[PDB]
Structures are given as structure tokens and as C-alpha cells.
Curated annotation (Swiss-Prot), chains A, B:
The chain crosses the membrane at residues 34-55, 59-79, 272-297, 311-336, 348-371, 386-413, 442-462, 464-481, 500-522, 529-549. Residues 238-243, 561-563 are annotated as: Cytoplasmic region required for homodimerization. Keywords: Calcium, Cell membrane, Glycoprotein, Ion channel, Ion transport, Membrane, Transmembrane, Transmembrane helix, Transport. This is Hyperosmolality-gated Ca2+ permeable channel 1.1. Residues 80-271, 337-347, 414-441, 482-499 are cytoplasmic. The gene is OSCA1. It comes from the Eukaryota. Disruption phenotype: Impaired osmotic Ca(2+) signaling in guard cells and root cells, and attenuated water transpiration regulation and root growth in response to osmotic stress. One of its GO terms (molecular function) is calcium-activated cation channel activity. Activated by mechanical pressure.
Length: 592, 592
């Protein structure tokens, strides 16, 4: 009810900030701070765009430009500070995690007389003698995991179809091989997913289990060398280990509860080849989506012609793309995993980066217009063998405002169940219920924010109306998402705001893009005294970015050796008698 | 005689390469390898430019482009290998130098209760506990050094005028204050530079000596923290020390015999301000020189009109700039020292970088033409209130070929004495004879090579005649400079080919510049199928550069921890009983 809504409202309001840092985490609290920065950049600039623009509506547009960029950059520095400080304070007042002591030594050189392990020990007992504790060679246990997951799949799927009414429960027969027979199959068989399957999978689990342990081919050329101190691991992580820059490549290891175990099986040789392939694939996907949008937009216009109304048209063009990009986030994740990164963090951050480039092109610069122009060129060939502010106003009304409305409705898992019903073999699915929240969304939420930053900063000097709408999104997001951060959303890895460097870059990108585009609208004709004015702005922005990347980014990309020593000494004093070998040895073998 | 010339010739030929690495050094041998790379890039490309160009003289120009760039890049990778390998081998088979164990901790935070030293000890005994050996706080002893140098100046200058004929030797009276009295002065006085001066300088030497030792204001906020092992110092050099990215800034210390002691006295706050100032100054100097060239070129043309002959004109325009840039190297050195770098290496490398940007503009792209065009615009205002291949052919004939001729003539110090005679108070100078060779010249020789690379790679697809001339320079340089490297030129610091990363970048710059310029000559008109062909070349070049910067550059910018441990263990075995405190403590106090 309205009352209940208002109540969750100031309930989420009555919690402090540092209490949330321990209640929810740092990742979540600085992600909530992105919306806050937005409200602290697009609010003052709206006040100025309603005093210089509308009343006096141009050298004032270029003056507004400067003022807007200054405030944006001022606030970005201030927030970089708070987030960097929070990260370093949190890092200190944390707990004990194995990663703090271990490093992944990728690409261990070939040895025709030793196992990878022997070689690793030798190397790290002569190179880091007083601190090397233990090494855990990583094995290719993706096969074991697949069978294990299949076993549970089988069991769960037909636990429903063996206990529904027991006895000879519905002996269904789906496609044994979709390539061979279409529709369904003829294996009525028995219950428990044709029990022989559960049995043979358990037998193959045992099979792989055997091989994995005793084969010396499962273990990849890598290990997770661990050290006695945080200080020592920090040293190893930020130090070159050998003459060959390809072999013995040590980097900070991540939380074991974050390691993407599947990708700890790809050679360092194949990585580069894969990278190229995945690169060009993203390119195609970009241009591709441009076209369905255009065509379905055209459909809408035709329907309207055949049949306020303009607002309705706008909102309908605004959806279509919505379902389309739902399909999109879905994928940006699989593409990163094909490149071959070994940690959830980087995979999620990769997706957000890739999302950015998409949303640049397809959704602002290079969208509707250019794609359709190329299509017209192609149609001519057949025959002879800042976009629109208004449209973005509709996107805010939908995308942003709709997002927060459905977030609070938590109707997202209901729609997941509805897609389950769209797949409907019968009317339902399996007895497996994967409903764990997961992360708030850096692979989804963050791209949204940065795209709205583009829209806002780009159209602020031009149209003074996107700002009021963009602002309300930021405000709503804060309150509804905070409520979730305290009430519903949990976490899956703690990187401690290591993504802020990335966020910063995208706001800086927005700024530069905005200025480059304003040098086009206010460059042609206008004045030859306004163009040089707008030519300095990008340079100033890059300057600020570089300053902030040298004053605040090190807090996210480097672990101060002093901070490590402090943590070590304090923990070695509070708990004078503690063993590390136990906590470290058994943490980096596959979870099989 | 001719015979003697031919003889120094194959004498320099009969020495091996690794024997020269120990005889002369690594710096010198890889600098000699720059000329060799040149001969191995511009020789095959000349053969192709005399088979595709002249016989068939355009899509062949674009084919030649590709082939030339491929060979250049192939050879650059091959040489990066040899130089990286040489560096790592030399580093291993070296001697003991203090730098291998110490790091400069710049920007030590303010302490209202401790001296810089106390603070440094505390920090490095709690942060690097098992390896910290000693710290040597650096003092501002530039004043002491100035008086010391003045004392020697006085003594030496008039040791000539006190022993020429003894007794009351020529009591000369130069300008006591040039601002006050012009020409000369009236202080006939006595011998030994007015002995009272030598006495009062010795008294002021004592004065500063006293203050320096006991004042606690001379010591700057810095120290040269030393460690017990090469491994440990390597760790400290490549590890962030504290949360504040401004304070406690550790970096590898250089050879004490390389430290530019004067600049170890500038605050980390003033550095940035100074940088900006120096930056804009270089800008002015660039454009400035463009103009004298133009005007003196104009003078030459007028003289010719009033009075082969065209060749003579070319060679005369080719000189003028020569004396002008003699004046130039002279300065690029003072500018770096004003920025505030603390080591000869970086100061010399800075000069070479700054020289590059000059020579780009003023000597190829942005030279004669554009400057004079702006001058014509200015003249109109008054009234109403790839350049030329031939010219560069002359530069090779002079600059390059003249350089090597005079190098072998060793008439350079004779010309230094001739400039002494140009200053001539009487006919001679002082009794001080600073004639030590110094370094072969990274601040002078290197800029030359890279400019000739530009000229060559740019004009190879166009004119097939600069290549033969450029080649002979490379060949001559090798033989004449090798002779000097074995017979005359010594060294002043050993960076062990740490400048190759810089060299590489400038050849890559040349490549990219060449391609961009060929997209202009072979872009307009020509074909719309040739422009995209030339658009991929820059990207491929950047790709190769990045590959090589990730495979070979780490050998110059990072010290493998494994190599350090190897060196340590071997030295600790050959000399089982050795003290380090002695060799390390007294090495980083000022040399006063």
C-alpha cells in the first residue's frame, strides 16, 4: 500500500552509511554512491540550465558548457576521494581471506623432468625464500564439475516426476537428440530421469574423479602460490618474477569464492587467438542490433499511420529496444567467459565495458541514423544492381523509471518464471529453484547509469528537460536500491570498490563525448571564437582524469605495503598463535 | 694518411662484439647497434625501391609501403631481442654497484617531532623489517658545491696569471659587475684571482660546511634507503609503500656516479609547477627557430640572385641550421635540469625526447612551409592594419656525413677551443682543461639517427635516392664511431641500454608519421581503394609496437626478482664473507 511504500522509504533512510558498509558491504555502498554522485552533478547543472537556457532562449551555451564540466569534474574528484578512503579503511578493518596471502602463477614453463608442482616449489623457494608457504596446483576439473552438475540436474528434474503421484509417474519422453528427432522423443522409460542416467552419471563422476586425481594432465600449467604474510604476497603480486615476460606470471589471486574455475584451464597461447575472435564478434553484434531497432521502429510508425499519441509512439519505440537489450545483458557475460578471464570480478567488469561501447554506438551516436543511412545505400544498390532528445526523454520514462519500479516489485524473478513458462514443456520446469539474489548488478546497473550520464551531460547545454527527468531516476534509484541493499540484495564476491576506476573512466568518456559533440552543434557557423573555446574543454577533462588517476586510482590497483604490514602486525598481536598453512593449503584446489 | 685511415678501419673491424661489451660497455655497444639496425632496414628497402620505383616510373607505391614497413618492423623486433638479451646477460655478469641495493624515498611526510631520518628509519624498519640496512638522508649541499667549484675556478684562472712570469704578473681588471660597469673593470689588484677572493671563498666554504652539517634544514625530505639484498631493493622499488600516493615514493636509485646532485633539492610540490613552465618554453623555442631558418634561407636566395650552383645553394641552406642546432643541443640539456630530474640518465633521455619533437616540426613536417605561411599572413596584416626531398639530400651530405668526418678528425674540441677564442678576453682562457670525452651522445647522436630514419622511411616510397645517401651515413657512422668507442670515447654512467625502449618508440613514430603522410600524397585523388589500404598500416604498426613493448620492454623497465636472487646467491657464495653496510652507508650523502 501507499503507506507501506512510504514506510520502507524512511526506514531505508534511517540507516547510517558505515553501518551499511558492514551490513551489506563496500561494493554495494559505493555502487549506491554512483546514484548519489549523479544527484550531485545533475542537480546544480539543471539549476543553471533553467536560468541561462529557458529564460534566454550562442556564447552562453559555451559558457554553460564550461560551468557544467567544472562541476561534474569537481564532484568526481570529491567522490573519488570518499571511495578511495572507504576502500582503504575497509581493507584495513576486514577479516581474513585466503586471497590476501596468495598469487596465481600463470604460465609455468615446460619441464621434461618435473611436474608443474615440483617446478613451482623450486622456483618459489629460491626466489621468495622466507615467505613461501604452500602452492596449490590448479587442475582441469571442469569435466568432473559438469558430470556433478548433470547428476543433480537429472535427480532434481525428475524428482518432480517421481513424487508427483509416485508409482509409475508420468513417463514423459522429450527429445533424446534434437538433431535426430524433432519435437520430442520416445524414451518413456522410468522415473528419476531414467534412473540408468543418474546411475551412469554417478559412474562417470567416479570415472572422472579417478582420472583427475591421478593423471598429471588435469593440473594446468599454473599454481596458486601462497605466502606467510600479506606483505609478502603483495610483494610477489607487484614484482616481475623472471626474464621471460611470458612465463611465471604472478598476479593477485582472488577470493576462492570468486574464482571462475572453468577458465583456469586455457593455455596462455590460446588466450590471444581467442581474444581476437571475441573482439570481432562484439563488432558484429553492435551493428546488428542497430537494424532490428530501425525495422521495428518502422513497423511502429506504419501501424500508427494505419490507425498523447506522439508520446505513445515514443514510449513504444522506447520499449522494443528494452526486450532486445534484456537479451543483450544476458550475452555480454558469455562473451567475456569465452575470452578466458579467471574471476567473476573481471568477467563482470568486462561485460560492463563491452556494454558501454554498445550503448555508445547503438543508443546515442551511431544509432538509428547512420545504420539506416547505410541501409538506404544498400537499398539503392538493390534498385540498381545527437539523435533526438525527445526519444531519450521516453527512454528515461521507461528504461530508468520502469527499471526501478520493477526492482521494487521484485517481479523480475516472476518474469524469470514467466520465461520458464514461455519455454514450457508442460506448464512448469524442474524442481531446481535458483533464486539467490546475486550482485546488485555491475554488468547491468552500471551500464545504465553511465548511459544516462551521457544523455544528461550531452543534452544539458541543448535541452533543459532531460535533466529534470534524469534526476528523478537518480533519486528513485537511490531509495529503492538502498532498500534492496539492506533488505534483499546480498553479494557474491568482495572486490571492495575495485570497479570505481572503471566507473570514473566512463563518466570522463561521457564528458569528452559531450564536448566533442557540442563542438559540432556549436562549431559549424556560430562563431570562429566559440570553436576554440570548445576545443580546450576536452583537454581540460583529460587533464583532470589523469590527475585523479594518479591521486586516487592507486588505492584500487595497488596494495600499500605499509597497510599490509599494519594488518599483519595487528592480527599477529590479537591472535598471537595462529596457523596459516591450514587456511591456505586447502583453498585453491578445484571445489570438486 | 689514407693508409692509416684504412688501417684504423679494419682494426676496429677485427674486434668482437662481446669483447667490446666489457671493453667499452653495454650502453655504447647497443648505441652502435642503432646504426647497424639502420643498415639492416634501409638496405633491403633500397633494393626494392630500385626495382619497383625507378624502372616503373600508383598502387605499386602502396605495395612498396607495406613491404617497407614489414621489413622495418621485422628488424626492430629482432634487434629488440638482441638488445634485451644483452641487457639481461650484462646485468647478470656485472660487478657490485651501490644502486643495486638502494632506493630513493622521495617526499617524506612532514614530522613536527622527528627528523626526516628518524621518520625514515621508523618507516623502513616496520615496513621492510628483515632487509632494511641503512638510510642516507640527502642534503642540500649545492651551496657548498658552488663555493667549492668557485674556489677551484679562482685558483686555476689566475694560476696562469701568477705564474706566466711570476712577480707582479699582468694585473688584469675585468668586469666586477657587468650590470654596473660595461666592458671591463678597474680591479687591477693582485694575483691568484685577487687572493682575498680565494681566501674569502675558502672562508665561505668553511661557513657553508659548518651550516650543512649542523642545521637540519639542508637535508631535503628524502633519503636513499638501502637494503641487504638485490632482491629486497627490487621489491621496494616496484612496490607502493603507503596509502598517500604522494608521500613515501620509492624508486630505484641510480649509480651514485650519475646522480645529478643539484636536483635532489626541489620539493615535490614545486616540480609540477616547474614542469608546466618548461613545457610552454619548449613550444616557443620550436616555432622560434623555424623563423631564423626561413629568413637566413631568404638571405641566401637573394645573394644567389645578385651574384653545381643549385647544389651549392642547397648545401648553404643546409649549413645555417647546423650552427643553429649546435646552439640547440647545447640548451635541451639546461631545460631538463630546470624541470628537476635527479639523474644524468633521465636528463639525457629527456633531451633526446625534446629534440625529437623539435626535429619533427622544424625539420620535416611544420618547417619552412607553415612558419613562412603564418609569416605571410602577418605581413598581410601589416599591409592592411613532406617539404622538399632535394633539401634533405643536402642535409645528409652535410649534417650526417660532416658529423662523422669531424668526429674522426676530433676537431670538435678544437672548435671548442675556437669558441673559447671567440669569447677571447685576450687570446686564451683559463688553466682549466675540461677535455674528458663524456658519453658518445644520446642527447645528440640519437636524435640525429631518428631524424634520418624519418627522412628515409618517409621518402622511400616517393624518392629512391635519399636511401643510398642515408645508407652510407649509417655505414660510416658504424666504422668511425666504433673506432672511437674502442679508442677514444669512454662513459659517464651505466644504464645498460635502458634507452632502447625510447629509441624503439621513435622508430615506430617515424613509421606512423611516414604512413600518415603517404595517405596524403597517395590519398587525394589516386584511388578510393588505395586510401583504405594505407589506413591499415598505422594500426598494424601500433600493433607491432605494443607487442614488442610487452615482450621486450620489461627487460629494461623491471628487474626480474629471479635474476636478483641468482646474482645474490652466486656473489654470496663466491665471496662468502662480505659486508654491505660499508659499501652502502657512504655512497649517497652529497659528494661534499
Amino acid at each position: 500500500s501507499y503507506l507501506k511504500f512510504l514506510h520502507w522509504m524512511p526506514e531505508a533512510l534511517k540507516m547510517p552509511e558505515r553501518e551499511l558498509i558492514d551490513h551489506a558491504g563496500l561494493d554495494s555502498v559505493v555502487y549506491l554512491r554512483i546514484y548519489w554522485l549523479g544527484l550531485k552533478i545533475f542537480a546544480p547543472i539543471a539549476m543553471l540550465a533553467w536560468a541561462v537556457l529557458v529564460p534566454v532562449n550562442f556564447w552562453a551555451h559555451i559558457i554553460m558548457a564550461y560551468a557544467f564540466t567544472i562541476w561534474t569534474c569537481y564532484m568526481l574528484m570529491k567522490e573519488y576521494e570518499t571511495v578511495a578512503n572507504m576502500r582503504l579503511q575497509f581493507l584495513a578493518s576486514e577479516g581474513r581471506r585466503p586471497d590476501q596471502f596468495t598469487v596465481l602463477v600463470r604460465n609455468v614453463p615446460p619441464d621434461p623432468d618435473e611436474t608443474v608442482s615440483e617446478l613451482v616449489e623450486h622456483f618459489f623457494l629460491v626466489n621468495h625464500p622466507d615467505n613461501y608457504l604452500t602452492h596449490q596446483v590448479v587442475c582441469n576439473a571442469n569435466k568432473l564439475a559438469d558430470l556433478v552438475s548433470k547428476k543433480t540436474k537429472l535427480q532434481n528434474w525428475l524428482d518432480y516426476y517421481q513424487l508427483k503421484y509416485t508409482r509409475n509417474n508420468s513417463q514423459i519422453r522429450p527429445i533424446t537428440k534434437l538433431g535426430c528427432l524433432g519435437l520430442c522423443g520416445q524414451k518413456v522409460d522410468a522415473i528419476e530421469h531414467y534412473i540408468a542416467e543418474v546411475d551412469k552419471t554417478s559412474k562417470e563422476i567416479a570415472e572422472e574423479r579417478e582420472n583427475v586425481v591421478n593423471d598429471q594432465k588435469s593440473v594446468m600449467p599454473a599454481s596458486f602460490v601462497s605466502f606467510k604474510t600479506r606483505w609478502a604476497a603483495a610483494v610477489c603480486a607487484q614484482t616481475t618474477q623472471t626474464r621471460n615476460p611470458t612465463e611465471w606470471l604472478t598476479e593477485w589471486a582472488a577470493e576462492p569464492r570468486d574464482i571462475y574455475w572453468p577458465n583456469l584451464a586455457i593455455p596462455y597461447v590460446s588466450l590471444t587467438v581467442r581474444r581476437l575472435v571475441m573482439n570481432v564478434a562484439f563488432f558484429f553484434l553492435t551493428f546488428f542490433f542497430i537494424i532490428p531497432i530501425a525495422f521495428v521502429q518502422s513497423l511502429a510508425t506504419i501501424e500508427g499511420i494505419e490507425k498523447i499519441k506522439s508520446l505513445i509512439q515514443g514510449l513504444l519505440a522506447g520499449i522494443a529496444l528494452k526486450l532486445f537489450l534484456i537479451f543483450l545483458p544476458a550475452i555480454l557475460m558469455t562473451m567475456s567467459k569465452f575470452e578466458g578471464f579467471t574471476s567473476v570480478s573481471f568477467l563482470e567488469r568486462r561485460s560492463a565495458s563491452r556494454y558501454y561501447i554498445f550503448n555508445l554506438v547503438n543508443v546515442f551516436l551511431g544509432s538509428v541514423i547512420a545504420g539506416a543511412a547505410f541501409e538506404q545505400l544498400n537499398s539503392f544498390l538493390n534498385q540498381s544492381p545527437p539523435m533526438k532528445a525527445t526519444a531519450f526523454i521516453t527512454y528515461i520514462m521507461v528504461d530508468g523509471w520502469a527499471g526501478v519500479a520493477g526492482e521494487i516489485l521484485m517481479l523480475k524473478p516472476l518474469i524469470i518464471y514467466h520465461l520458464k513458462n514461455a519455454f514450457l514443456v508442460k506448464t512448469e520446469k524442474d524442481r531446481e529453484e535458483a533464486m539467490n539474489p546475486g550482485s546488485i548488478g555491475f554488468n547491468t546497473g552500471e551500464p545504465q547509469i553511465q548511459l544516462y550520464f551521457l544523455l544528461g551531460l550531452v543534452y544539458a547545454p541543448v535541452t533543459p528537460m532531460l535533466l529534470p527527468f534524469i534526476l528523478v531516476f537518480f533519486a528513485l534509484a537511490y531509495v529503492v536500491y538502498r532498500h534492496q541493499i539492506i533488505n534483499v540484495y546480498n553479494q557474491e564476491y568482495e572486490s571492495a570498490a575495485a570497479f570505481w576506476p572503471d566507473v570514473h573512466g566512463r563518466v570522463i568518456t561521457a564528458l569528452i563525448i559531450s564536448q566533442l559533440l557540442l563542438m559540432g552543434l556549436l562549431g559549424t557557423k556560430h562563431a570562429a571564437s566559440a570553436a576554440p573555446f570548445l576545443i580546450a574543454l576536452p583537454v581540460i577533462t583529460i587533464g583532470f582524469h589523469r590527475f585523479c588517476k594518479g591521486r586516487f586510482e592507486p588505492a584500487f590497483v595497488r596494495y600499500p605495503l605499509q597497510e599490509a604490514m599494519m594488518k599483519d602486525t595487528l592480527e599477529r598481536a590479537r591472535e598471537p598463535n595462529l596457523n596459516l598453512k591450514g587456511y591456505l593449503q586447502d583453498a585453491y584446489i578445484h571445489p570438486v
